[PDB]
Amino acid sequence: PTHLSVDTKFKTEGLCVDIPGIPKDMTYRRLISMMGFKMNYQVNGYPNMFITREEAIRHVRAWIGFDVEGCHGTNLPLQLGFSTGVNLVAVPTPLMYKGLPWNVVRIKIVQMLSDTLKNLSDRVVFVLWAHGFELTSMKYFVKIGPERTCCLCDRRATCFSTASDTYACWHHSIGFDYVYNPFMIDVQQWGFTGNLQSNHDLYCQVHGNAHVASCDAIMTRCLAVHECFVKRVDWTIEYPIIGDELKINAACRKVQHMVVKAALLADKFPVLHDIGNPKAIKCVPQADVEWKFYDAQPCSDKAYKIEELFYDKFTDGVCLFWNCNVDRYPANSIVCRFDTRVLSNLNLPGCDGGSLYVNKHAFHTPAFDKSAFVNLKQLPFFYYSDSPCESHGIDYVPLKSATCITRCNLGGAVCRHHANEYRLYLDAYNMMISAGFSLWVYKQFDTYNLWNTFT
Ligand SMILES: Cc1ccsc1C(=O)O
Numbered sequence: 001p002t003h004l005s006v007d008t009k010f011k012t013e014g015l016c017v018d019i020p021g022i023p024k025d026m027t028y029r030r031l032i033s034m035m036g037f038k039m040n041y042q043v044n045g046y047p048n049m050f051i052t053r054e055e056a057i058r059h060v061r062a063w064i065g066f067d068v069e070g071c072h073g074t075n076l077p078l079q080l081g082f083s084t085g086v087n088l089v090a091v092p093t094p095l096m097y098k099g100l101p102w103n104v105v106r107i108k109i110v111q112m113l114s115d116t117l118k119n120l121s122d123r124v125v126f127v128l129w130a131h132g133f134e135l136t137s138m139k140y141f142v143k144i145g146p147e148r149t150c151c152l153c154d155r156r157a158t159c160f161s162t163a164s165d166t167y168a169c170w171h172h173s174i175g176f177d178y179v180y181n182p183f184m185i186d187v188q189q190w191g192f193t194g195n196l197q198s199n200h201d202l203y204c205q206v207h208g209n210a211h212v213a214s215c216d217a218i219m220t221r222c223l224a225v226h227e228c229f230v231k232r233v234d235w236t237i238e239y240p241i242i243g244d245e246l247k248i249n250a251a252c253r254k255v256q257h258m259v260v261k262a263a264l265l266a267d268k269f270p271v272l273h274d275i276g277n278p279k280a281i282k283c284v285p286q287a288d289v290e291w292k293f294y295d296a297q298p299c300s301d302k303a304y305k306i307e308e309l310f311y312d313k314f315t316d317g318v319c320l321f322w323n324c325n326v327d328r329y330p331a332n333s334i335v336c337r338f339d340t341r342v343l344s345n346l347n348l349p350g351c352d353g354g355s356l357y358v359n360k361h362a363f364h365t366p367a368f369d370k371s372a373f374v375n376l377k378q379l380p381f382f383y384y385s386d387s388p389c390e391s392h393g394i395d396y397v398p399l400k401s402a403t404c405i406t407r408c409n410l411g412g413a414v415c416r417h418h419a420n421e422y423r424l425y426l427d428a429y430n431m432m433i434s435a436g437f438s439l440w441v442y443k444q445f446d447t448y449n450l451w452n453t454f455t
Protein backbone atom coordinates (compact mmCIF):
# COMPACT_ATOMS: atom_id res chain seq x y z
CA PRO A 1 0.00 0.00 0.00
CA THR A 2 2.91 2.43 -0.73
CA HIS A 3 2.98 2.87 -4.57
CA LEU A 4 0.51 1.99 -7.41
CA SER A 5 1.24 -1.66 -8.33
CA VAL A 6 2.22 -2.41 -11.95
CA ASP A 7 0.02 -5.54 -11.64
CA THR A 8 -3.06 -3.26 -11.02
CA LYS A 9 -5.63 -3.37 -13.84
CA PHE A 10 -5.83 -0.45 -16.26
CA LYS A 11 -9.30 0.13 -17.86
CA THR A 12 -8.55 0.48 -21.59
CA GLU A 13 -12.05 1.37 -22.91
CA GLY A 14 -11.13 5.04 -23.23
CA LEU A 15 -8.09 4.03 -25.37
CA CYS A 16 -9.84 1.82 -27.96
CA VAL A 17 -10.58 4.63 -30.46
CA ASP A 18 -6.92 5.59 -30.96
CA ILE A 19 -5.99 1.90 -30.28
CA PRO A 20 -8.74 -0.36 -31.79
CA GLY A 21 -8.50 -3.95 -30.61
CA ILE A 22 -6.93 -3.14 -27.24
CA PRO A 23 -7.44 -6.02 -24.75
CA LYS A 24 -10.07 -5.25 -22.12
CA ASP A 25 -7.84 -7.05 -19.55
CA MET A 26 -4.72 -4.94 -19.15
CA THR A 27 -2.33 -4.13 -16.28
CA TYR A 28 -0.06 -1.11 -15.77
CA ARG A 29 2.86 -3.51 -16.51
CA ARG A 30 1.58 -4.45 -19.99
CA LEU A 31 0.53 -0.83 -20.69
CA ILE A 32 4.02 0.57 -19.85
CA SER A 33 5.62 -2.20 -21.93
CA MET A 34 3.20 -1.37 -24.80
CA MET A 35 4.16 2.33 -24.48
CA GLY A 36 7.76 1.32 -25.33
CA PHE A 37 9.42 1.23 -21.90
CA LYS A 38 11.51 -1.58 -20.38
CA MET A 39 11.05 -1.41 -16.59
CA ASN A 40 13.50 -4.43 -16.04
CA TYR A 41 12.49 -5.26 -12.30
CA GLN A 42 14.28 -2.14 -11.11
CA VAL A 43 14.22 -1.70 -7.30
CA ASN A 44 15.71 1.78 -7.60
CA GLY A 45 12.89 4.13 -6.53
CA TYR A 46 10.81 4.14 -9.74
CA PRO A 47 8.32 1.23 -9.32
CA ASN A 48 5.72 2.55 -11.74
CA MET A 49 5.31 5.51 -14.13
CA PHE A 50 1.61 5.80 -13.11
CA ILE A 51 0.63 6.81 -9.57
CA THR A 52 -2.27 6.58 -7.08
CA ARG A 53 -4.80 9.41 -6.56
CA GLU A 54 -3.25 9.85 -3.03
CA GLU A 55 0.30 10.24 -4.33
CA ALA A 56 -0.97 12.69 -6.99
CA ILE A 57 -2.55 14.81 -4.21
CA ARG A 58 0.70 14.92 -2.23
CA HIS A 59 2.37 16.06 -5.50
CA VAL A 60 -0.22 18.57 -6.80
CA ARG A 61 2.53 21.26 -7.37
CA ALA A 62 3.85 18.83 -10.07
CA TRP A 63 0.50 18.45 -11.97
CA ILE A 64 0.71 19.32 -15.66
CA GLY A 65 -2.25 18.36 -17.82
CA PHE A 66 -1.12 16.59 -20.98
CA ASP A 67 -3.15 15.83 -24.14
CA VAL A 68 -2.20 14.64 -27.64
CA GLU A 69 -4.48 15.16 -30.64
CA GLY A 70 -3.40 13.52 -33.91
CA CYS A 71 -3.80 16.38 -36.52
CA HIS A 72 -3.96 13.99 -39.50
CA GLY A 73 0.19 7.52 -35.02
CA THR A 74 3.84 7.97 -36.32
CA ASN A 75 2.29 8.33 -39.85
CA LEU A 76 0.43 11.64 -39.03
CA PRO A 77 1.58 14.77 -37.11
CA LEU A 78 0.61 15.32 -33.44
CA GLN A 79 -0.56 18.39 -31.53
CA LEU A 80 1.05 18.29 -28.06
CA GLY A 81 -1.04 20.26 -25.59
CA PHE A 82 -0.16 21.20 -22.00
CA SER A 83 -2.00 23.03 -19.15
CA THR A 84 0.64 25.78 -19.49
CA GLY A 85 -1.40 26.84 -22.64
CA VAL A 86 1.36 25.55 -24.95
CA ASN A 87 0.67 23.55 -28.18
CA LEU A 88 3.69 22.04 -29.96
CA VAL A 89 3.25 20.23 -33.32
CA ALA A 90 5.47 17.16 -33.83
CA VAL A 91 6.19 15.65 -37.32
CA PRO A 92 7.62 12.11 -37.66
CA THR A 93 9.77 12.82 -40.83
CA PRO A 94 -3.58 28.92 -26.47
CA LEU A 95 -0.01 29.20 -27.91
CA MET A 96 -0.18 27.28 -31.25
CA TYR A 97 3.30 26.44 -32.76
CA LYS A 98 4.04 25.15 -36.35
CA GLY A 99 5.13 21.56 -37.26
CA LEU A 100 8.67 20.47 -36.23
CA PRO A 101 10.48 17.06 -35.83
CA TRP A 102 10.58 15.30 -32.41
CA ASN A 103 14.29 16.02 -31.85
CA VAL A 104 13.58 19.79 -31.53
CA VAL A 105 10.10 19.43 -29.93
CA ARG A 106 11.63 17.37 -27.01
CA ILE A 107 14.17 20.21 -26.30
CA LYS A 108 11.23 22.70 -26.13
CA ILE A 109 9.33 20.29 -23.78
CA VAL A 110 12.25 20.12 -21.31
CA GLN A 111 12.54 23.97 -21.32
CA MET A 112 8.81 24.53 -20.61
CA LEU A 113 8.51 21.98 -17.73
CA SER A 114 11.82 23.13 -16.23
CA ASP A 115 10.77 26.79 -16.26
CA THR A 116 7.26 25.95 -14.98
CA LEU A 117 8.15 23.46 -12.22
CA LYS A 118 11.61 24.50 -10.95
CA ASN A 119 10.09 26.58 -8.15
CA LEU A 120 7.22 24.30 -7.17
CA SER A 121 8.26 20.67 -7.45
CA ASP A 122 11.02 18.02 -7.56
CA ARG A 123 9.06 16.16 -10.33
CA VAL A 124 6.31 16.33 -13.02
CA VAL A 125 2.95 14.50 -12.92
CA PHE A 126 1.16 14.25 -16.29
CA VAL A 127 -2.54 14.56 -15.65
CA LEU A 128 -4.18 12.56 -18.45
CA TRP A 129 -7.66 11.79 -19.81
CA ALA A 130 -6.16 9.05 -21.97
CA HIS A 131 -7.30 8.11 -25.42
CA GLY A 132 -4.10 6.39 -26.67
CA PHE A 133 -1.97 8.95 -28.57
CA GLU A 134 -0.48 10.62 -25.44
CA LEU A 135 0.86 7.40 -23.92
CA THR A 136 2.28 6.17 -27.23
CA SER A 137 3.93 9.54 -28.02
CA MET A 138 5.76 9.62 -24.64
CA LYS A 139 8.65 7.45 -25.87
CA TYR A 140 9.53 10.41 -28.16
CA PHE A 141 10.34 12.76 -25.24
CA VAL A 142 10.70 10.56 -22.09
CA LYS A 143 13.59 8.29 -20.82
CA ILE A 144 13.14 6.07 -17.71
CA GLY A 145 15.59 4.30 -15.35
CA PRO A 146 16.77 4.24 -11.73
CA GLU A 147 16.27 7.26 -9.45
CA ARG A 148 19.17 9.73 -9.81
CA THR A 149 20.57 13.09 -8.66
CA CYS A 150 21.48 16.23 -10.65
CA CYS A 151 25.01 16.53 -12.13
CA LEU A 152 25.26 20.09 -10.67
CA CYS A 153 23.35 19.61 -7.34
CA ASP A 154 21.76 17.21 -4.77
CA ARG A 155 18.17 17.33 -6.11
CA ARG A 156 16.56 14.35 -7.86
CA ALA A 157 16.93 14.17 -11.65
CA THR A 158 13.99 15.19 -13.81
CA CYS A 159 15.79 15.62 -17.20
CA PHE A 160 18.47 13.86 -19.28
CA SER A 161 20.89 15.01 -22.01
CA THR A 162 21.91 12.65 -24.86
CA ALA A 163 24.59 15.16 -26.00
CA SER A 164 26.46 14.92 -22.66
CA ASP A 165 25.11 11.62 -21.19
CA THR A 166 24.33 13.43 -17.86
CA TYR A 167 21.18 14.02 -15.71
CA ALA A 168 19.80 17.22 -14.17
CA CYS A 169 16.96 18.66 -12.05
CA TRP A 170 14.66 21.53 -13.36
CA HIS A 171 17.13 24.21 -12.21
CA HIS A 172 20.13 22.80 -14.21
CA SER A 173 18.47 21.32 -17.31
CA ILE A 174 19.51 24.03 -19.83
CA GLY A 175 20.21 22.32 -23.16
CA PHE A 176 18.73 18.98 -21.98
CA ASP A 177 16.55 16.99 -24.44
CA TYR A 178 14.77 14.20 -22.44
CA VAL A 179 12.25 14.12 -19.62
CA TYR A 180 13.70 11.67 -17.10
CA ASN A 181 11.45 9.48 -14.88
CA PRO A 182 8.18 11.43 -15.16
CA PHE A 183 4.94 10.46 -13.34
CA MET A 184 1.41 10.23 -14.73
CA ILE A 185 -2.19 9.70 -13.69
CA ASP A 186 -5.17 8.86 -15.89
CA VAL A 187 -8.30 10.65 -14.69
CA GLN A 188 -10.48 8.35 -16.81
CA GLN A 189 -9.43 5.57 -14.32
CA TRP A 190 -11.41 7.29 -11.54
CA GLY A 191 -14.75 6.15 -12.97
CA PHE A 192 -16.41 8.78 -15.12
CA THR A 193 -19.50 8.53 -17.32
CA GLY A 194 -19.07 10.61 -20.46
CA ASN A 195 -16.34 12.64 -22.21
CA LEU A 196 -13.95 15.27 -20.75
CA GLN A 197 -16.03 18.33 -21.75
CA SER A 198 -19.27 16.86 -20.28
CA ASN A 199 -17.66 16.03 -16.93
CA HIS A 200 -15.50 19.15 -16.67
CA ASP A 201 -18.36 21.57 -17.64
CA LEU A 202 -20.49 20.13 -14.83
CA TYR A 203 -18.24 22.19 -12.46
CA CYS A 204 -16.26 24.78 -14.46
CA GLN A 205 -17.54 27.67 -16.61
CA VAL A 206 -14.07 29.44 -16.83
CA HIS A 207 -12.36 26.94 -19.18
CA GLY A 208 -13.86 26.52 -22.64
CA ASN A 209 -13.13 23.76 -25.16
CA ALA A 210 -11.59 25.54 -28.13
CA HIS A 211 -10.82 22.05 -29.70
CA VAL A 212 -7.04 22.45 -29.28
CA ALA A 213 -4.89 19.96 -27.34
CA SER A 214 -3.95 22.54 -24.68
CA CYS A 215 -7.69 23.23 -23.96
CA ASP A 216 -8.16 19.53 -23.11
CA ALA A 217 -4.98 19.45 -20.99
CA ILE A 218 -6.37 22.47 -19.02
CA MET A 219 -9.92 20.97 -18.61
CA THR A 220 -8.22 17.66 -17.44
CA ARG A 221 -6.00 19.21 -14.69
CA CYS A 222 -9.07 21.33 -13.79
CA LEU A 223 -11.32 18.21 -13.36
CA ALA A 224 -8.49 16.46 -11.44
CA VAL A 225 -8.14 19.54 -9.12
CA HIS A 226 -11.95 19.59 -8.61
CA GLU A 227 -12.14 15.88 -7.71
CA CYS A 228 -9.27 16.06 -5.21
CA PHE A 229 -9.58 19.57 -3.67
CA VAL A 230 -12.97 21.15 -4.41
CA LYS A 231 -15.27 18.16 -3.66
CA ARG A 232 -12.88 16.01 -1.60
CA VAL A 233 -10.93 17.96 1.02
CA ASP A 234 -8.03 16.50 3.00
CA TRP A 235 -6.41 19.10 5.31
CA THR A 236 -4.22 16.38 6.87
CA ILE A 237 -1.75 16.40 3.91
CA GLU A 238 1.22 18.55 4.70
CA TYR A 239 3.15 20.25 1.88
CA PRO A 240 6.88 21.19 1.98
CA ILE A 241 8.22 24.76 2.17
CA ILE A 242 8.92 26.13 -1.33
CA GLY A 243 8.88 29.91 -0.65
CA ASP A 244 8.04 32.61 1.89
CA GLU A 245 5.43 30.41 3.66
CA LEU A 246 6.75 31.06 7.20
CA LYS A 247 7.10 34.83 6.74
CA ILE A 248 3.67 35.11 5.00
CA ASN A 249 1.93 33.30 7.90
CA ALA A 250 3.74 35.21 10.62
CA ALA A 251 2.79 38.43 8.77
CA CYS A 252 -0.90 37.35 8.59
CA ARG A 253 -0.91 36.74 12.38
CA LYS A 254 0.79 40.11 13.08
CA VAL A 255 -1.54 42.00 10.71
CA GLN A 256 -4.61 40.33 12.22
CA HIS A 257 -3.65 41.32 15.78
CA MET A 258 -3.00 44.97 14.69
CA VAL A 259 -6.09 45.39 12.48
CA VAL A 260 -8.51 43.93 15.05
CA LYS A 261 -6.86 45.68 18.05
CA ALA A 262 -7.19 49.10 16.38
CA ALA A 263 -10.80 48.50 15.26
CA LEU A 264 -11.75 47.75 18.89
CA LEU A 265 -9.96 50.90 20.23
CA ALA A 266 -11.36 53.19 17.43
CA ASP A 267 -14.99 52.07 17.64
CA LYS A 268 -15.13 50.42 21.08
CA PHE A 269 -17.59 47.65 19.92
CA PRO A 270 -19.06 45.58 22.79
CA VAL A 271 -19.23 42.22 21.02
CA LEU A 272 -17.03 40.72 18.26
CA HIS A 273 -18.53 37.84 16.18
CA ASP A 274 -15.63 35.66 15.13
CA ILE A 275 -16.97 33.82 12.07
CA GLY A 276 -14.65 31.29 10.46
CA ASN A 277 -12.14 28.54 11.32
CA PRO A 278 -13.35 26.31 14.23
CA LYS A 279 -9.75 26.12 15.64
CA ALA A 280 -9.43 29.95 16.07
CA ILE A 281 -8.10 31.89 19.09
CA LYS A 282 -8.69 35.52 20.20
CA CYS A 283 -6.17 37.43 17.99
CA VAL A 284 -6.27 40.33 20.51
CA PRO A 285 -6.19 38.33 23.80
CA GLN A 286 -6.22 41.39 26.07
CA ALA A 287 -9.29 42.95 24.27
CA ASP A 288 -12.15 44.27 26.48
CA VAL A 289 -14.80 43.00 23.93
CA GLU A 290 -17.15 39.97 24.27
CA TRP A 291 -15.55 37.45 21.89
CA LYS A 292 -18.09 34.93 20.49
CA PHE A 293 -16.89 32.20 18.05
CA TYR A 294 -18.83 30.65 15.09
CA ASP A 295 -17.45 27.59 13.34
CA ALA A 296 -17.20 27.49 9.54
CA GLN A 297 -14.55 25.49 7.65
CA PRO A 298 -12.81 27.04 4.55
CA CYS A 299 -15.31 26.77 1.63
CA SER A 300 -13.55 25.15 -1.35
CA ASP A 301 -16.49 24.98 -3.80
CA LYS A 302 -18.78 28.11 -3.78
CA ALA A 303 -18.52 31.02 -1.29
CA TYR A 304 -20.74 30.85 1.78
CA LYS A 305 -24.12 32.56 1.45
CA ILE A 306 -24.03 35.13 4.32
CA GLU A 307 -27.72 34.20 4.94
CA GLU A 308 -26.92 30.46 5.35
CA LEU A 309 -24.21 31.44 7.90
CA PHE A 310 -26.44 33.64 10.12
CA TYR A 311 -29.77 31.75 9.89
CA ASP A 312 -27.44 35.45 16.65
CA LYS A 313 -27.41 39.35 16.95
CA PHE A 314 -24.70 39.84 14.27
CA THR A 315 -25.66 43.50 13.80
CA ASP A 316 -24.46 44.40 17.32
CA GLY A 317 -20.71 45.08 17.31
CA VAL A 318 -18.33 43.89 14.60
CA CYS A 319 -17.98 40.64 12.60
CA LEU A 320 -14.50 39.26 12.05
CA PHE A 321 -14.27 37.33 8.76
CA TRP A 322 -10.61 36.24 8.71
CA ASN A 323 -10.28 34.08 5.53
CA CYS A 324 -13.96 33.10 5.82
CA ASN A 325 -15.14 33.74 2.23
CA VAL A 326 -18.83 34.77 2.19
CA ASP A 327 -20.82 36.06 -0.87
CA ARG A 328 -21.55 39.63 0.51
CA TYR A 329 -20.12 40.82 3.80
CA PRO A 330 -22.24 42.74 6.32
CA ALA A 331 -21.55 46.50 6.68
CA ASN A 332 -20.11 45.98 10.26
CA SER A 333 -17.16 43.70 9.23
CA ILE A 334 -13.36 43.29 9.42
CA VAL A 335 -12.33 41.04 6.47
CA CYS A 336 -9.30 39.22 5.10
CA ARG A 337 -10.11 37.62 1.73
CA PHE A 338 -7.54 35.73 -0.35
CA ASP A 339 -7.34 37.17 -3.91
CA THR A 340 -7.26 34.08 -6.15
CA ARG A 341 -5.93 36.08 -9.16
CA VAL A 342 -2.50 36.61 -7.51
CA LEU A 343 0.56 35.20 -9.31
CA SER A 344 2.81 33.17 -6.92
CA ASN A 345 4.50 29.76 -6.29
CA LEU A 346 1.92 29.08 -3.51
CA ASN A 347 -1.09 29.82 -5.75
CA LEU A 348 -1.77 27.15 -8.44
CA PRO A 349 -4.60 27.54 -11.07
CA GLY A 350 -7.95 26.28 -9.81
CA CYS A 351 -11.44 25.24 -10.82
CA ASP A 352 -14.21 27.69 -11.98
CA GLY A 353 -12.10 30.84 -11.42
CA GLY A 354 -10.92 29.63 -8.01
CA SER A 355 -7.35 28.81 -7.03
CA LEU A 356 -5.49 26.11 -5.15
CA TYR A 357 -3.52 27.96 -2.46
CA VAL A 358 -0.88 25.58 -1.14
CA ASN A 359 0.81 26.84 2.07
CA LYS A 360 1.31 23.88 4.53
CA HIS A 361 -2.11 22.68 3.29
CA ALA A 362 -4.03 22.84 0.00
CA PHE A 363 -6.92 25.31 0.17
CA HIS A 364 -8.99 25.48 -2.98
CA THR A 365 -10.44 28.99 -2.69
CA PRO A 366 -13.53 30.15 -4.65
CA ALA A 367 -13.19 32.90 -7.30
CA PHE A 368 -12.36 36.40 -5.97
CA ASP A 369 -15.58 38.45 -6.39
CA LYS A 370 -15.22 42.25 -5.98
CA SER A 371 -18.93 42.61 -5.19
CA ALA A 372 -18.55 40.71 -1.87
CA PHE A 373 -17.12 44.01 -0.43
CA VAL A 374 -19.79 46.58 -1.53
CA ASN A 375 -20.76 47.53 2.04
CA LEU A 376 -17.06 47.70 3.07
CA LYS A 377 -14.01 49.85 2.01
CA GLN A 378 -10.35 48.83 1.49
CA LEU A 379 -8.55 48.96 4.81
CA PRO A 380 -5.52 51.27 4.49
CA PHE A 381 -2.01 50.73 5.89
CA PHE A 382 -1.40 51.97 9.46
CA TYR A 383 0.91 50.93 12.30
CA TYR A 384 -0.54 51.45 15.77
CA SER A 385 1.44 51.07 19.02
CA ASP A 386 0.54 51.88 22.62
CA SER A 387 3.76 50.19 23.96
CA PRO A 388 6.28 52.40 25.77
CA CYS A 389 9.02 54.24 23.87
CA GLU A 390 11.84 52.07 25.24
CA SER A 391 14.73 51.14 22.87
CA HIS A 392 16.47 48.03 24.39
CA GLY A 393 19.26 47.13 21.91
CA ILE A 394 20.88 47.63 12.67
CA ASP A 395 21.42 51.38 11.90
CA TYR A 396 18.84 54.28 12.11
CA VAL A 397 17.53 57.11 9.79
CA PRO A 398 14.80 59.28 11.43
CA LEU A 399 11.34 57.95 10.53
CA LYS A 400 8.71 60.35 9.21
CA SER A 401 5.27 58.85 8.53
CA ALA A 402 1.62 59.91 8.94
CA THR A 403 0.64 56.23 9.42
CA CYS A 404 2.87 55.63 12.51
CA ILE A 405 0.07 56.03 15.09
CA THR A 406 2.27 56.23 18.28
CA ARG A 407 2.68 58.58 21.35
CA CYS A 408 6.09 59.63 19.99
CA ASN A 409 4.67 60.56 16.57
CA LEU A 410 1.79 62.40 18.30
CA GLY A 411 4.48 64.14 20.41
CA GLY A 412 6.32 65.16 17.24
CA ALA A 413 9.33 62.84 16.85
CA VAL A 414 9.12 58.96 16.46
CA CYS A 415 11.46 57.01 18.86
CA ARG A 416 13.91 54.40 17.48
CA HIS A 417 11.86 51.50 18.95
CA HIS A 418 8.63 52.48 17.15
CA ALA A 419 10.61 53.33 13.96
CA ASN A 420 12.17 49.79 13.93
CA GLU A 421 8.77 48.17 14.75
CA TYR A 422 6.99 50.32 12.13
CA ARG A 423 9.33 49.24 9.32
CA LEU A 424 9.14 45.60 10.52
CA TYR A 425 5.30 45.78 10.46
CA LEU A 426 5.37 47.50 7.04
CA ASP A 427 7.48 44.56 5.75
CA ALA A 428 5.09 41.99 7.26
CA TYR A 429 2.18 43.98 5.76
CA ASN A 430 3.72 44.18 2.21
CA MET A 431 4.62 40.46 2.50
CA MET A 432 0.94 39.56 3.19
CA ILE A 433 -0.56 41.81 0.48
CA SER A 434 1.83 40.41 -2.16
CA ALA A 435 1.05 36.81 -1.09
CA GLY A 436 -2.49 37.61 -2.48
CA PHE A 437 -4.42 38.53 0.70
CA SER A 438 -6.80 41.49 0.69
CA LEU A 439 -8.04 43.59 3.67
CA TRP A 440 -11.45 45.29 3.93
CA VAL A 441 -13.11 47.18 6.81
CA TYR A 442 -16.46 48.85 7.78
CA LYS A 443 -16.81 52.36 6.14
CA GLN A 444 -16.66 54.16 9.52
CA PHE A 445 -13.07 52.99 10.17
CA ASP A 446 -10.87 56.03 10.85
CA THR A 447 -7.32 55.79 12.22
CA TYR A 448 -7.71 59.43 13.40
CA ASN A 449 -9.76 57.89 16.30
CA LEU A 450 -6.61 56.16 17.62
CA TRP A 451 -4.67 59.32 18.53
CA ASN A 452 -7.03 59.86 21.52
CA THR A 453 -6.16 56.38 22.95
CA PHE A 454 -2.97 58.02 24.43
CA THR A 455 -4.41 60.89 26.57
C1 LIG B 1 -26.53 32.11 15.18
C2 LIG B 1 -26.82 30.65 15.30
C3 LIG B 1 -27.36 30.07 16.47
C4 LIG B 1 -27.63 28.75 16.35
S1 LIG B 1 -27.16 28.13 14.82
C5 LIG B 1 -26.60 29.69 14.33
C6 LIG B 1 -25.98 29.79 12.98
O1 LIG B 1 -25.49 30.87 12.66
O2 LIG B 1 -26.00 28.79 12.25
Ligand SMILES: Cc1ccsc1C(=O)O
Residues within 6 Å of the ligand: 238, 239, 240, 241, 245, 246, 359, 360
Ligand atom coordinates in the same frame (compact mmCIF):
# COMPACT_ATOMS: atom_id res chain seq x y z
C1 LIG C 1 6.06 22.54 7.49
C2 LIG C 1 5.42 23.83 7.09
C3 LIG C 1 5.10 24.15 5.75
C4 LIG C 1 4.50 25.35 5.61
S1 LIG C 1 4.18 26.08 7.12
C5 LIG C 1 5.06 24.86 7.94
C6 LIG C 1 5.27 25.01 9.41
O1 LIG C 1 6.16 24.36 9.94
O2 LIG C 1 4.54 25.80 10.00
Ligand SMILES: [Zn+2]
Residues within 6 Å of the ligand: 150, 151, 152, 153, 154, 155, 168, 169, 170, 171, 172
Ligand atom coordinates in the same frame (compact mmCIF):
# COMPACT_ATOMS: atom_id res chain seq x y z
ZN1 LIG D 1 20.40 20.43 -10.09
Ligand SMILES: [Zn+2]
Residues within 6 Å of the ligand: 200, 204, 205, 206, 207, 218, 219, 222, 223, 351, 352
Ligand atom coordinates in the same frame (compact mmCIF):
# COMPACT_ATOMS: atom_id res chain seq x y z
ZN1 LIG E 1 -12.23 24.27 -15.63
Ligand SMILES: [Zn+2]
Residues within 6 Å of the ligand: 388, 389, 390, 406, 407, 408, 409, 414, 415, 416, 417, 418
Ligand atom coordinates in the same frame (compact mmCIF):
# COMPACT_ATOMS: atom_id res chain seq x y z
ZN1 LIG F 1 7.81 55.73 20.58
